[PDB]
């Protein structure tokens, strides 16, 4: 694979240098647009673009999407600092779309676990929009020490048992110091027309965070990309994985 | 009974040597077929064939189906290595069919517990297909030690409390290192036509794993063979067994 | 048309005779590159070359790719024996490229079945690289007689029921006498970017054998040439013809 | 076509003379069996048998099933009289099976109206068994005159307005003089497995009379032959035909 | 307006002469195609084409769609006879699409009654496919006289009281002589997204006949053209019109 | 193999030369029967005859039925001109029968595509007898130039977009210059009686042209010979290959 430091470099280079068929510096422009008075909170990257410019890296995104996405976001940040002298920009997401293969929900095997997959389906349900504690901040009631603990929207809350400074077992989550983002669950499944007669359609539950929340309603036909996550299903006696799609990019089909 | 080492021997011998009424070396042929470009993941063995060739062993399959099946699978593996020079073949299941007795669901007594029974019925329900963690791999966050723990689809997840190398109570299940296979629950019961008027039909729940998942729909009339498992029913106050059929082979009736 | 006897000669001419715009015997050159420290197992023949030199034969490899390719491979083999005193080289593929017409996946029709087509597309997925028994040698264990069954990579392993000599059924596959090569499946489709608004992209499955496996990854834009095969579906429920592309030559699009 | 008199002749001849591949006089035997102490109330005729013996007649059965069946039944009657000296035998049905084409329910077009079609499907519903007034006998309360009026199980009761002898408008149906037979409605439709994904299965309602009543339960997979009848659907505003299958023969599939 | 005779003329002329931007004689070609081995049963005409060629006529189609469509169909027939020497072609529908205005369901006012409107909506429901008696044929049981009576899929069956030849009140509908076509009801309504918050969406019921039956499922977004029909709603005490869309052309939106 | 030039000669020999066990020039006889008061439009060539006389050519009509048949029909045509001074006779079909191998419908595989096969089966249904434009002659209305498009009965009417002479798009189909013949579709399947317990019977669709239409009815046991064609499905939703049998000769089973 490719270590983080070097991905950031390669990504930063891609954003700056990539140009399309007509010579348009697509991502330079997208990043420039971040200086507009009401900017976007993400930059969508066409996987095919990245694959034609630095293929080895493009495949790393699919193999290690967590590090891949993270590096890409770190690069956006340094391009904003080095090329636009903007520091206070806040989080900008890297959302990859147009992957080489589109799976049906039924195709999502366990060989995909923790990779970036692209799935086409119809939205069966959407949850209500709630605040997800993306960063929990715990505060000791004795020394007043602060412990930052990032969370994952598919795993249960990672608490702290004792203070990392004064060993005290008197800590609570500080609701104000903690950071919260929008969260919305949804479900997609294969449409019956895509299957054989009397075949039971399969489904998968996803998570939308931040700015891609509330972009789809039930009945919508979508192409999502995301990391396939598995967590142990507590509904079952025996160890069964419950699949969750942590969505990286979502758009309707046409 | 018969110890494992000797079963493997006897099984390997059976697979190589058995020939039917016309002199066809059935199982030699079935195993040869495993070298085709898209092979099966199991070898179905006609219990009657095995009984006519090594009857003592055939009865051992019914008495100790767990060791019996395992030995048969280990034999398949050594026949592939010794006779076909194939090592990387992966798991091939031994699925025994055509047992001497066919039970109705109502006939399944506790004298069958952990034996291989053959049941005829009609499928009342099928579950959704899920990934069952057939092999859990735990990883220590301190020494990075790896512990392999195989699972059973009818028992709850067997965790590990502390590291087996550095005694550390800081281990988690590694979702990527673990192996998962397909899983599907189903229910069969006796058809009313087979019973007396106003008799309440009885049912039993089964498990299908791997490649025999999704081979039956509700309304289907099947003959399954499988190990009868009992686990303590948590629904009841008092100790009651909940029967589960861990399916070894399934086919529709004709 | 041309019978295969005469093709071998006409090809062996072409290989020796053909000279480019500079008077170099290109294909004489390529043939020698098969005698290097580590050689090549293929000779890439430009179709335009064969056309400008023996237009009738060039038109023939398209109408009858199987005999066309086979005859050229026989000519390569006699030019080794006759012009370089080498008959130990083994199988050398003749891979034709730069054909007169280029199809999009959607343009593939019934008129191409068993003809050499050239398809431009993007790779959707690629399979695991596995061994394919390309020539099966069956040995009767009774009389010792050998039987040679050649295989097609798009059909399942074809066997022999009884010994053609002594009628016996006690036969086995001799893995040593048999020939195996690498196999890799892959899928290409038309690039959504070359299609109308909501036009579903057409896809086709390919086969790569021997020295052209592992040549491509998903996302690769390629030009394959190959024989269109139709194969009867394995699923025995009023089955139907699916199409496979047996790849003859594959290079990335320029 | 063929007039009634001549059909009866040809049918009578067929029953007597037909012999199968082994020289068995199948229908002679079936009719002989009618002299057993507890006889059947119908004779099933294999359409293929009749087609091989008197093809012109076999096609007449399908074209005019009402006259065809009737003639066949009249012939059975005269064979019983002329060859077995039995008169008091009662009604014996001619039930033709094994027609040349099997329709799915969705294939039943209006070009079938009043022809003998053969349909395969799954029974969705069965009605309760009721007595159908196959022959209504009306009796004048003035002159005591009796009027016989046969009925059809798909049309409403054909009454009489006035006495055919004394012109009196004082007639009622005589419940005792009238003849009643068993009647049972049922519904078959195509199974989802036979259709495309998300395709709405179509159905048709049938009538079973006399001795073929209560031979099928819901869930059963049947092949029925019958005359397709249409009557004006009163549920609709506009003129729509409601299809009814008046079953001639029914058997489960295998 | 324009009398029938003259419309047919003008239409026939349009079909023969019209050419598009590239000089393609679109409708000449569409009609030529009717001589293929498996032809269509309708010719779709782009209203815009007709408007650019004979605008006065195009507006007549909207004003009097019943005469307009009929004339267009009569013209198709005479073009087939005069230009292709085909008489036995059967009914070919004229289906106009792409009208100048697209109404939402809520826009369908009574000023549209018996005009050709074009509506966009989402299919809420579809009925089961039934045979509609498009032509009832009545037969006198006395003189055997035949009376043809065409029907409309939105009006109740138009019977005949007495024979038009022997004045006899003894006539019945002859189910075999009558002609039946496919029929399917459906409902479309405006999607909530197209309306204001908390606005109750409005709907309309349609009829599909013949070859445009079963071309839409619930959830489909369609653009239909059709004659708006009103019939007196029998559900209400007071005189209220029930709107019905007699569909002339339907296609999904993109 | 054999080029068509040489086939014509080899066939014209066979027709003149071949003599039976009694020394009669059978095919000379059959050719004259084309000059009777009312003649025949076909010459039924027994494959066994052609085989025992010119084994290489006989094997050729099977491998290349289209050129084989075509060449024989050219030879028939020159033997008329040369041996009987007749060149006004018009198309005479060469219909080959009594082929070496007989397939059941289920035995038809991809290896038969575009080869002459012989299938025994029973007729399930037969179509309406309609006209098929076998040769379309297109006349440009601007410059007067004629263009000849030959047709296949298993594809749709192929046309010409613009005049090859003057580039004009003002083209029309000249029905008089064009050739049409009768067409009838039919379906045969294996007889359930030659199949196992619950074995679904396989079916195939055939085409009868010209003088072999109306030759069979449902229920007829027949032996057809013909070219297996695969045609790309008209339904443009990832379409697939269906198989049609273009019938060369058909007779009832003896
Ligand atoms: Zn503290
Ligand atoms: Zn440890
Ligand atoms: Zn031998
Ligand atoms: Zn009276
Ligand atoms: Zn009358
Ligand atoms: Zn011209």
Author numbering:
A (entry chain C), B (entry chain D), C (entry chain H), D (entry chain C), E (entry chain D), F (entry chain H): 0 to 253
Wording from the paper:
The second mutant (PfMCMN-F179A) involves a residue at the heart of an inter-subunit hydrophobic interface in the PfMCMN-WT hexamer crystal structure. This phenylalanine aligns in sequence with a phenylalanine of Mcm4 whose mutation, Mcm4(Chaos3), severely disrupts Mcm4:Mcm6 association and has been associated mammary adenocarcinoma. The crystal structure of PfMCMN-F179A is isomorphic with that of PfMCMN-βT and shows a similar central pentamer with adjacent subunits interacting via a short antiparallel β-sheet interaction: P130 carbonyl - F240 amide and V132 amide - P238 carbonyl with a shift in the P238 carbonyl position relative to PfMCMN-WT that is similar to PfMCMN-βT. The shifted positions of the P238 carbonyl and the β-turn are likely not directly induced by the F179A mutation because this mutation is not in close proximity. Instead, this structure suggests that the wild-type β-turn can be induced to accommodate either pentameric or hexameric ring structures. AUC sedimentation velocity experiments of PfMCMN-F179A (470 μM) and PfMCMN-ΔZFD (360 μM) showed exclusively monomeric species at all concentrations tested, indicating that these mutants do not form detectable oligomers in solution. The pentameric ring structure of PfMCMN-F179A observed crystallaographically is not maintained in solution under all conditions tested. The PfMCMN-F179A pentamer found in the crystal structure is likely stabilized by crystal-packing interactions, including interactions with the peripheral subunits. We therefore consider a ssDNA-bound monomer of PfMCMN-F179A to be the most likely species detected by EMSA at high concentration. The monomeric preference of PfMCMN-F179A is consistent with the ablation of Mcm4:Mcm6 association in MmMcm4 F345I and also the monomer observed by size-exclusion chromatography for the similarly positioned L189D/D191R double-mutant of SsoMCM.
The Minichromosome Maintenance (MCM) complex forms an essential hexameric-ring helicase that unwinds DNA at the replication fork (1–3). MCM proteins have three conserved domains: an N-terminal domain (MCMN) that mediates the head-to-head interaction of the initial double-hexamer; a conserved AAA+ ATPase domain; and a short helix-turn-helix domain at the C-terminus. Crystal structures of the N-terminal domains of Methanobacterium thermautotrophicus (MtMCMN), Sulfolobus solfataricus (SsoMCMN) and Pyrococcus furiosis (PfMCMN) show a consistent hexameric ring structure with three subdomains: a helical subdomain-A, a Zn-binding subdomain-B and an OB-fold subdomain-C. The crystal structure of PfMCMN bound to single-stranded DNA (ssDNA) revealed that subdomain-C binds ssDNA in the plane of the hexameric ring via conserved residues defined as the MCM single-stranded DNA-binding motif (MSSB).
